[PDB]
Design a protein around this ligand. Structure first.
Ligand SMILES: [Cl-]
Length: 213
């Protein structure tokens, strides 16, 4: 039973703005949405201790391994205004998460908001071209995370208020790969990103799913 038998479990995050805070992401050059000097948001989160992940980690006996979160970043290679996000997409950052026991994937909001093509469910044979679309990219993501971190527990986190297609696709693909999908609900947002209240709700809802397992 005792925590010291196996030590604290190490949590890494592969995220977007919702999981960012200035000075607390790796690589440090990853774009952040919260806590950025001279880029004040109309959103009441001002301290890292209010973030969902900091709360989740410090409340439940975990240790932060890596917070690889990047503002605006998409799961697939298609960004905003059809920009090429091959330089920052989730699927390009999957090797830089340290040595986690737990991986929390929290993406897809930008794929939804940018209107990235949905494409086809695809469980092998991925080309770079294919990976500009959402379904092949998210399949490739889980498939690759499972191969790189075969001993880790991987949880997907689905933002509320995304397109039907992005929402349904992540749930179906999580089911294919046997990954738990945390379907967030009733998340208070300001300027399209969680508020202090919203961050608490995310923390609590992630813990609802992670606790039993
Ligand atoms: Cl990286």
């Amino acid at each position: 039973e005792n925590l010291y038998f196996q030590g604290q479990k190490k949590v890494s995050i592969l995220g977007d703005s919702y999981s960012t805070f200035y000075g607390h992401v790796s690589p440090a050059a990853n774009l952040c949405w919260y806590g950025v000097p001279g880029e004040k948001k109309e959103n009441d989160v001002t301290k890292v201790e209010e973030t969902w992940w900091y709360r989740f980690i410090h409340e439940h006996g975990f240790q932060l391994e890596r917070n690889n979160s990047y503002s605006g970043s998409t799961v697939c290679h298609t960004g905003y205004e059809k920009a090429d996000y091959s330089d920052r997409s989730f699927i390009t950052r999957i090797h830089n998460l340290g040595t986690p026991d737990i991986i929390l994937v929290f993406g897809g909001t930008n794929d939804s908001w940018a209107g990235a093509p949905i494409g086809a469910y695809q469980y092998d044979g991925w080309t770079k071209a294919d990976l500009y679309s959402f379904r092949p990219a998210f399949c490739y993501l889980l498939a690759s995370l499972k191969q790189l971190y075969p001993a880790a527990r991987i949880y997907n986190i689905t933002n509320s208020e995304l397109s039907e297609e992005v929402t349904d696709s992540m749930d179906e693909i999580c089911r294919h790969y046997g990954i738990e999908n945390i379907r967030l609900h009733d998340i208070d947002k300001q300027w399209g990103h969680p508020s202090v209240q919203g961050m608490q709700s995310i923390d609590a809802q992630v813990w609802e799913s992670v606790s039993p397992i």
